[PDB]
Amino acid sequence: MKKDIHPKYEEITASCSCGNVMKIRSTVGHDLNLDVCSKCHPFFTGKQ
Amino acid sequence: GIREKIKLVSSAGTGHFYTTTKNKRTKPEKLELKKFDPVVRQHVIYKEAKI
Amino acid sequence: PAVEVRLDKWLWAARFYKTRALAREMIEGGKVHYNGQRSKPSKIVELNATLTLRQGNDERTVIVKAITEQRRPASEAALLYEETAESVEKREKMALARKLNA
Amino acid sequence: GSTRNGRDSEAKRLGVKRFGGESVLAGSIIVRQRGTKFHAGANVGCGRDHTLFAKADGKVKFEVKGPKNRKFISIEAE
Amino acid sequence: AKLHDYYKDEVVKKLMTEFNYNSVMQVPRVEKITLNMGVGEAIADKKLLDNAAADLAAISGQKPLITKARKSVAGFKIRQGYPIGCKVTLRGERMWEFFERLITIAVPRIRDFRGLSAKSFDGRGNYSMGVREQIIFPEIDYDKVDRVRGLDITITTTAKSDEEGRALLAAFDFPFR
Amino acid sequence: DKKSARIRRATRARRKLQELGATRLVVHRTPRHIYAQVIAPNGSEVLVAASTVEKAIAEQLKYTGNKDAAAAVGKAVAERALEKGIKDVSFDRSGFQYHGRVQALADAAREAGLQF
Amino acid sequence: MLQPKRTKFRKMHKGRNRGLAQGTDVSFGSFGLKAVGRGRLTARQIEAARRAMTRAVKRQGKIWIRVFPDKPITEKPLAVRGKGKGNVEYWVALIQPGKVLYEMDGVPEELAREAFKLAAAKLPIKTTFVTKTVM
RNA sequence: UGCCUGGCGGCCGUAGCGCGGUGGUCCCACCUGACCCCAUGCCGAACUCAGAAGUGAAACGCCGUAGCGCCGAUGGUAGUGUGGGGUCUCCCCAUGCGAGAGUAGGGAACUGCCAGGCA
RNA sequence: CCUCCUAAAGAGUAACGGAGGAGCACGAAGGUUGGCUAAUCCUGGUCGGACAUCAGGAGGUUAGUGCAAUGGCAUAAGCCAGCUUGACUGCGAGCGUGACGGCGCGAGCAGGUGCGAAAGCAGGUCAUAGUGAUCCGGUGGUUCUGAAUGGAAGGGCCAUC
RNA sequence: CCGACUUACCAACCCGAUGCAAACUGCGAAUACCGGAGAAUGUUAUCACGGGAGACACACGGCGGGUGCUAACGUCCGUC
RNA sequence: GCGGGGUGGAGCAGCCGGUAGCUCGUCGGGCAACCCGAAGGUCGUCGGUUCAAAUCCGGCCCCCGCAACCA
């Protein structure tokens, strides 16, 4: 992988109102707050 | 045609020169190249000059 | 190879008159003046040459260098005829006189 | 009665100057051609205009070789 | 590499029992993820391509390769030798991490979401899907974005055909509807 | 199709060298081993060969796929070549970029006294 | 009238007409009209024979024309000496012996012979009637 | 000495496609990691290095199979050199050469050098 | 002046015969080293639709060649990048083509250089058109000559307009 | 929507069958031409150098052709 | 027989490989003169080249300047 051309990429914690916590990498830098998580989406849950 | 003939004068100070062509419109920059010069016998840098 | 320009042709390009026939009629009537004197339609307009044109009731004097055979939009006509500052002042003087008359 | 044709170019004397089995001195032009119709093989050089010339004395020889079945000229040394 | 070890432990055996494969690597695998757009409206301004490139530098985690006009098309007013979009290819740690981002955060985030078609598989096991909006991704922000934009996501899988493709994505729990 | 691509890129130097008619030192590179041969101008007969698959060289080396192994096989082929009396060859890149283990092979053969 | 929709070259050399024909065997139908001598059949001749046959059979049998005019023949206008090749006037098909000119199916042999006899009078070359052969 | 594998060739479709099957001790391939030698007009895809956990899936090799490709007679036909002739825009005759297409058919390559694993 | 056919399977071959181009372009569009392979079609995919870019498959050069056509081109002569000026100086075994003037191809030798680790390649471009004799003068270098001698003017040789 | 409904119907590519080409060729002669070896024959018939020219308006016929109307005792080429 | 032209209702550049515009005519608005906005071609017709024809080539229709002369 090339040296210094690419944007900064780092481990970041992502949080959601549903409350699960998972480790993920992104270029965003500051912590991420999500309206909908995967485990709380109605279709993925199968409830609706 | 549009290309105008020019002389590449040896920088060795021996007066030898080459003749080539170029067009002034697209490439207004000076032409400079390392070409052989028989009288001094060495590869010396030639700069263009008027014909 | 400069292309010669007629006086009525220049006027028609400048849009002063609706048609070249009207330009010829006005020139032949003596109302139009070139260099402040009566002139025939055959006369040639020249760059930096005064055109003491008389249109309607207000005089104009232009010395424009850009002469165009082709009639242009009025936005271009403003550039086509120069309308020097003295001519502007004289035109506004004539306009004020007309307003006083009215 | 005017015609737009009547124009042609002088013929260029192409073709095979030396045919198979002919003894040629070094440097003799073997074939003059447009494009590498005959390719360069052993002891044969290809000039800039795709002419082929013997690089050594011997007997010229045509043959068919290679996956493309192209013709090759080579000087059997002698 | 959470999806990487997901694949290594349990998706591999799930697919192996489900299709009765003799050799382990016979299970289909996801070789690469490719993101690309047609920015054909870059013929008006060159700079808008730079914004596209920066946006997906942020989205993908690597500097996009600009794409090139393959050949002239007059009907679209483009001639050969013009940049008309960008692309980014993701493999390995990045390919998994982006897949994780997709499944976890992106696929919830599309408005009016009713599913993702199962008919989008090409026919040789490689899946394709189109993303209309970029705000769905966490990295891109709504306030500083320039214009509504989209992209396409292609996943390439050594899978031989459609059913092994859908089985792979189902085992990874990719939504389908 | 790595093999076909490699043969394609090697063919130009291959046929140019065949045209010159010089003795050709061919190198093969593989993730596990590395082979070397010295082929006469006609391209048929092989004069001297040496590879890390051979038990003679294999048991000295820790691993047969590394640059040190490449250097050892290079020294071996050079010694065999000097024994038979070739003393000069033309290297065959063989589509392998002149770098890494092939590069080490070339340097080992050069230091061994083989002129190329 | 039959004419090529497009051609690479507007004018073509006169050429010659040696050799025997190809496509001698009737192939597309039950009956056919052969040629016995060399000739140059114009598009007008083709059209005239076509009309004669079609009307003779009264739109019952299906018709095939195995010759197409594709050689442009030029003619100088009157009162000219030299000065380049003349304009194209009509198109012709070169015919050698054996060339099945026309072919018919779906009609009794007797009426087929009648129609072909009527049409052969419009052509310049001698013709004969030939039937389908299994091989 | 026999089988199998890798490289380098000879030859350039009887030798190449398609379809089915088979191979992992050695060899090959895929494959694990890549901060570094090296590289991505992004990507360890390619190239490159460090290795040997798994496998023969893909590729590769090998065996079989005419759905193709390909090769291809004998006979006739076309053409034509020389001489003669006719009803001379075209033919014919003696003699020499003799196609192309098509038919019967052949066909799933053969082979040299070196190295390695097994018996 | 160049390409094709007429042109009759070596070369050559006329017509107020049939058809098209030239009077350039390029210090990179040259040299070398390394790398790569097209058109077209099908399927899937946001704007995007017949044709934009992405992925895969079929196909195998039907693409591309700076400009006409022919002949070439996968070892690529096609496309990309790094470094560079061999678009060098003096010669030239031999040969092609012309009545001649001339035009063309050229391994190799010497000096020096570029690329390549090296083998090697490079004396312009894929080739064939992109041209102008002699005279008369112009410019720079070189005592070669210099109408008594020493210089100069002019002339000469080389480069060049 | 798919599934297809008849045409006033038009149908691209592909497939099967039949032709045509000077500027089409995945095939391909007879002749001619270049070279090599061999016997017979031929007044060196061949090449080079030198002295002297003439000639550079051709015609018809056979064969292969362009133009013409496969007209001309027409015109322009190739070979005899 | 040789060359030119065929472009909003009329007159016109362009245009001459790179998405059709100007004046007048019409309408409306500003204001007889003058200024602004809009509808208005599908480039004489049919084919070919090109990634693409107002553009470039072949043929066809009409109109224009010419010559169709010496015997």
Swiss-Prot record, chain B:
Keyword line: Methylation, Ribonucleoprotein, Ribosomal protein, RNA-binding, tRNA-binding
TM region positions: none
One GO molecular-function entry: tRNA binding
Signal peptide (from-to): none
PROSITE patterns per record: RIBOSOMAL_L33
Gene3D superfamilies linked: Ribosomal protein L33
GO BP annotations, alphabetical order: cytoplasmic translation; response to antibiotic; ribosomal large subunit assembly
RNA-binding as UniProt keyword: yes
Quaternary structure and interacting proteins, as annotated: Part of the 50S ribosomal subunit. Cross-links to the P and E site tRNAs.
Family classification: Belongs to the bacterial ribosomal protein bL33 family.
Remaining remarks: Surface exposed on the 50S subunit.
Name listed for the protein in its UniProt record: Large ribosomal subunit protein bL33
Source organism (scientific name): Escherichia coli (strain K12)
From Swiss-Prot, chain C:
One GO location term (cellular component): cytosol
Segments forming domain S4 RNA-binding: 5-67
Keywords: DNA-binding, RNA-binding, Stress response
Source taxon at top rank: Bacteria
Keyword match RNA-binding: yes
Induction note: By heat shock.
Keyword Transmembrane included in the entry's annotation: no
GO MF: DNA binding; ribosomal large subunit binding; single-stranded RNA binding
GO biological process: cellular response to heat; response to heat
Family of the protein in this entry: Belongs to the HSP15 family.
Function text: Involved in the recycling of free 50S ribosomal subunits that still carry a nascent chain. Binds RNA more specifically than DNA. Binds with very high affinity to the free 50S ribosomal subunit. Does not bind it when it is part of the 70S ribosome.
Subunit structure: Monomer.
Protein name: Heat shock protein 15
Classification of source organism: Bacteria, Pseudomonadati, Pseudomonadota, Gammaproteobacteria, Enterobacterales
Curated annotation (Swiss-Prot), chain D:
GO biological process, alphabetically ordered: assembly of large subunit precursor of preribosome; cytoplasmic translation; cytosolic ribosome assembly; positive regulation of ribosome biogenesis; regulation of cell growth; ribosomal large subunit assembly
Entry keywords, A to Z: Ribonucleoprotein, Ribosomal protein, RNA-binding, rRNA-binding, tRNA-binding
Identification of the protein by name: Large ribosomal subunit protein bL27
Any one Gene Ontology molecular-function term assigned to this protein's record: structural constituent of ribosome
Record-linked InterPro entries: Ribosomal_bL27, Ribosomal_bL27_CS
Subunit structure: Part of the 50S ribosomal subunit. Cross-links to the 23S rRNA. Cross-links to the A and P site tRNAs.
Region (Disordered): 1-13
Domain of life: Bacteria
Positions of transmembrane segments: none
Family that this chain belongs to: Belongs to the bacterial ribosomal protein bL27 family.
One GO cellular component term noted in the UniProt record for this chain: cytoplasm
Originating gene: rpmA
Curated annotation (Swiss-Prot), chain F:
PTM comment, free text: The protein has been shown to contain a phosphoserine, which was required for the protein to bind to 5S rRNA. However, the presence of this phosphoserine is controversial, and it has not been seen by mass spectrometry.
Keywords, comma-separated and alphabetical: Phosphoprotein, Ribonucleoprotein, Ribosomal protein, RNA-binding, rRNA-binding
InterPro entries in alphabetical order: Ribosomal_uL18_bac-type (IPR004389), Ribosomal_uL18_bac/euk (IPR005484)
Domain of life of the organism encoding this protein: Bacteria
Region described as Required for binding of the 5S rRNA/L5/L18 complex to the 23S rRNA: 1-16
Keyword RNA-binding: yes
GO biological process: cytoplasmic translation
Gene Ontology cellular-component terms listed: cytoplasm; cytosol; cytosolic large ribosomal subunit
Gene3D superfamilies: 3.30.420.100
Domain notes: The basic N-terminus is not necessary for binding to 5S rRNA. It is however required for cooperative binding of L5 and L18 to 5S rRNA as well as for binding of the 5S rRNA/L5/L18 complex to the 23S rRNA.
Subunit: Part of the 50S ribosomal subunit; part of the 5S rRNA/L5/L18/L25 subcomplex. Contacts the 5S and 23S rRNAs.
Family: Belongs to the universal ribosomal protein uL18 family.
HAMAP family xrefs: Ribosomal_uL18_B
NCBIfam families recorded: L18_bact
Annotated protein name in UniProt: Large ribosomal subunit protein uL18
Lineage: Bacteria, Pseudomonadati, Pseudomonadota, Gammaproteobacteria, Enterobacterales
